[PDB]
Amino acid sequence: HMGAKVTVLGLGPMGAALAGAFLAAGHRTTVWNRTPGKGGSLAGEGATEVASAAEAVAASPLVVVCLATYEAVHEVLDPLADELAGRTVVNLTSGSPVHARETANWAQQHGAEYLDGVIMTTPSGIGKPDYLLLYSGSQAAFDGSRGTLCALGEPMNLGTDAAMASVYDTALLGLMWGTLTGWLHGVALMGADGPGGNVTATAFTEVANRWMKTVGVFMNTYAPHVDAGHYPGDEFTLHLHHRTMNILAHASELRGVVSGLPELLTELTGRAITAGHGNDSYARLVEFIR
Amino acid sequence: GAKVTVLGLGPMGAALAGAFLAAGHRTTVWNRTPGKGGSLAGEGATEVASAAEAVAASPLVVVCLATYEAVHEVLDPLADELAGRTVVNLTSGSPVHARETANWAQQHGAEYLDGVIMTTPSGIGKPDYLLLYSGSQAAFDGSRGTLCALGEPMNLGTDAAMASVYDTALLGLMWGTLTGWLHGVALMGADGPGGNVTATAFTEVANRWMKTVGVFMNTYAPHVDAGHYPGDEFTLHLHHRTMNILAHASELRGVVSGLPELLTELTGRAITAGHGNDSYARLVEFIRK
Ligand SMILES: NC(=O)c1ccc[n+]([C@@H]2O[C@H](COP(=O)([O-])OP(=O)(O)OC[C@H]3O[C@@H](n4cnc5c(N)ncnc54)[C@H](OP(=O)(O)O)[C@@H]3O)[C@@H](O)[C@H]2O)c1
Ligand SMILES: NC(=O)c1ccc[n+]([C@@H]2O[C@H](COP(=O)([O-])OP(=O)(O)OC[C@H]3O[C@@H](n4cnc5c(N)ncnc54)[C@H](OP(=O)(O)O)[C@@H]3O)[C@@H](O)[C@H]2O)c1
Ligand SMILES: O=C1NC(=O)c2c1c1c3ccccc3[nH]c1c1[nH]c3ccccc3c21
Ligand SMILES: O=C1NC(=O)c2c1c1c3ccccc3[nH]c1c1[nH]c3ccccc3c21
Ligand SMILES: [Cl-]
Ligand SMILES: [Cl-]
Ligand SMILES: [Cl-]
Ligand SMILES: [Cl-]
Ligand SMILES: [Cl-]
Ligand SMILES: [Cl-]
Ligand SMILES: [Cl-]
Ligand SMILES: [Cl-]
Ligand SMILES: [Cl-]
C-alpha cells in the first residue's frame, strides 16, 4: 500500500531495470553497483544509491541480487555473512542448479531466507504484463515478498528446492527453441514457390497463433501420460505421427526447406515404432530421449 | 436449417455430419459402403443410397474421403450434376491434388473450396479447433455460417492448394513444440538438483510461458517478411550461448533428443556468417533454398 524497503545489488541492464520497476511501484529502493556511475538516472527516479554493498544490505530486509554470475554473487555476499542474518535474499542471477543449491545452503547457514529465481524476459519486459519471473526456495520468503516482487512481473512459486528455477529456465528455453524452430520451418515451407505457396510469414503466423491453442491441448493431454507411464494413443498414434512426418519431409525436400527437423522427428518416432509402440501417444517418446 | 450433404462416413466424415446435425442443419449423408449411417439417421440425418441423390439434395456438398483418387471416383460421374453447387473438399492430400481438383471443379461450374481438418474426430464441433479453407471466396463467404458447425473456419486465401501446405507447416510447428516440450519434461524429471519435477507441474508453468513464446513469433514474422532481423535485447549471440548451456545441462542429466545439437549447428552457421546481433528470424535464411 505505502511501499516496502527493497535493495537491488547490480546495476547492469537487468538489475537497473529491476530497480526501476521497484521504484515505479512506489517502493523505497536502495541500489548499489560495484562500479560507480551507473545509477544517476535511477537517483532521479527516487532511488538511493550507496557506495558499498554493506550499506545497501543494511538498508532493507529484502535484498534482490542480479549480477553477472554466481561467482560474482559470492564475491559480493561472502564478506556480508553476518550482515545478512534475518534478511531475505532473492537471487535473480542466472546460473546452474548446483550453484543455486550451494548459495541456498550458505544463506541458510547464516540465517538469511533464500529464494532463487530466473527472469523469463529481457530488461524491457520487466514490469509489463504476462512476463514471468520464476522463484524457488524459501516459501516464507516468497509469501512475505510476493507483493513487492509483483513490481517486476508475474511471480510463480515453483517449490521449495532452490535449484528448481535454474532447471525450469533451461527446460523452458528448450521448449521455446523447439517451438520457434518448428515455426521457422513452417514459415519457410509456406514462403517457398509452389502450388499453395508464396504465403507471407505474417499470414502464416496469424493462423499459427490460433493453432497453438490446439498444440497446448496436446501438451496438457500428454503430461499425465508421462507421469503415469501409460501412453494411450487414442485418435493420434505414433504410426500417424510417423506417416505425416514423412509427408512433411517430402514436402520440405521438394520446396528446398532443409532444417534437420523432419529427420530428427522421423528417427525418433521410428525408434519407438520399431520397439513396438506405434499405437501409443507422442508421450511415449519421453522414454526414447531420457 | 441450411441444407448440407456429407459424402463419406468414415470416422471423420461421420463426425462432420454429426456436427452439422448438432447445429441444426438439414443434413443428407451418403457412403460408398452401406450400413454406416444408422446413428446419424437416429440424430435426424437423411441417409440416401447413391451419391447422385446426395449431391442433388443440397447446394453445399462436403466431401471427406480417404484419398483424392476416391474423390474423383465419386464425383467424376456427377460432373453435370455439380454445376452451380458448392463443393467443400476436406480430404487430405497434396497441393497438386487440390489444384487439379479445383481446376476440374471450375471446368464444370462448381464452386470449389479445399480444406484441411486440424483435429481428430473427437475435436469436431468443439471450441478452438480449426478447419482451414482455400479456394473460392464466394464459397467461403456463402458457406461460412454452415461450416462454423464443424469448428472455427479460417479462409487462407484464393489458391485451393494453400490448405494442404498449411497443414504440413502447422504440423511441423506442432512437432517442434512437442519435441521441445518432451525435452523439457525429461530435463525436469531427471535426477539432480532442482529435478524430479513431474510433467504436469512443468506443463503448468510451460502453459504460461507459451504466451511469451507467442510474443516472439509475432515479433519475428515481420522480420522475415521485411528481410530485416534486428536482434534488440535477444540476439543470435545470446541464443547460441544459452543453447550451449542447454546442451551441457542435457548431457549431465542424460537427456539425448538431438535438439540441442540441431540448434547450436543452425545458430552457429548464422553467427559464422556475421549475424550474431540479429533476431531468431534471420535463421530462415539458413534453412531455406
Ligand atoms: N539482460 C537480460 O536480458 C537478462 C535476462 C534474463 C536474465 N538475466 C540475468 O541477469 C543477470 C545480470 O544481467 P545483466 O544484463 O544486467 O548484465 P551482466 O553483464 O550479466 O551483469 C552485469 C552486472 O554484474 C556485475 N558484476 C559482474 N561481475 C561482478 C563481480 N565480480 N563483482 C561484483 N559485481 C559484478 C556488474 O557490475 P559492474 O558494473 O561493476 O561490472 C553489473 O552490475 C545475469 O545473470 C543475466 O544472465 C539477464
Ligand atoms: N480421422 C482423422 O483423425 C482425420 C484428421 C484429419 C484429416 N482426416 C482426413 O479425413 C479423410 C477421411 O478420414 P477418415 O478418418 O474418415 O478415414 P479414411 O480411411 O481416410 O477414409 C474413409 C472414407 O473414405 C471412403 N472411401 C475410400 N475409398 C473410396 C472410394 N474409392 N470411393 C468411395 N469412397 C471411398 C470410405 O468409404 P467406405 O466406408 O465405403 O470404405 C470412408 O467413407 C482422410 O482424407 C483423412 O486424412 C482425418
Ligand atoms: O544472460 C542472459 N540474458 C538474457 O536475456 C537471458 C539470459 C539467460 C541465461 C544466462 C546464463 C545461464 C542461463 C540463462 N538463461 C537466460 C535467459 N532466459 C530468458 C527467457 C526470456 C528472455 C530472456 C532470457 C534469458
Ligand atoms: O490421415 C490423417 N488422420 C489424422 O488425424 C490426420 C491425417 C492427416 C493427413 C493424411 C495424408 C496427407 C496429409 C495429412 N495431414 C493430416 C492431419 N493433420 C492433422 C492436425 C491435427 C489432428 C489430426 C491431423 C491429421
Ligand atoms: Cl554513492
Ligand atoms: Cl560462475
Ligand atoms: Cl536447497
Ligand atoms: Cl506455382
Ligand atoms: Cl490467437
Ligand atoms: Cl440408404
Ligand atoms: Cl490420391
Ligand atoms: Cl540431487
Ligand atoms: Cl495459462
Residue numbers in the entry:
A (entry chain B): 0 to 289
B (entry chain A): 2 to 290
Please share text taken word for word from the publication where this structure appeared.
RedE, an IRED, serves as a biosynthetic enzyme in the formation of the indolocarbazole natural product reductasporine. RedE resembles the canonical IRED fold with an N-terminal NADPH-binding Rossmann domain and a C-terminal helical bundle mediating homodimerization. Here, we present crystal structures of RedE, including apo, NADP+-bound and two ternary complexes with AFA and NADP(H). These crystal structures reveal an unexpected secondary indolocarbazole binding site adjoined to the primary active site, and site-directed mutagenesis shows both are critical for catalysis.
As the substrate and products of RedE are transiently stable, we elected to use AFA as a mimic, because it shares the planar indolocarbazole core of 3. Processing diffraction data of RedE crystallized from solutions with 1.2 mM AFA and 10 mM NADP+ show electron density consistent with both AFA and NADP+ in each protomer. In this structure, the positioning of NADP+ is similar to that observed in the binary complex. AFA sits above the si-face of the nicotinamide C4 with the maleimide carbonyl situated 3 Å away in a geometry ideal for hydride transfer. AFA is enveloped by a highly hydrophobic pocket lined with M119, T121, L172, M175, W210ʹ, F217ʹ, F235ʹ, L239ʹ, T243,ʹ and I246ʹ, and anchored within it via interactions to D168 with each indole nitrogen. Lastly, the guanidine group of R242 hydrogen bonds to the maleimide carbonyl. RedE maintains this active site aspartate (D168); however, it is solely used to anchor the indolocarbazole substrate in the primary active site via hydrogen bonding to the two indole N-H moieties. Inspection of the active site reveals there are no candidates for a catalytic base in RedE, with the only protic residue within a 5 Å sphere of the AFA maleimide group being R242, an unlikely proton donor. Given the ternary complexes of RedE have little to no room for the Rossmann domain to move toward the dimerization domain due to the tightly packed AFA in each binding site, the structure of RedE may represent a maximally closed conformation despite resemblance to other IRED open conformations.
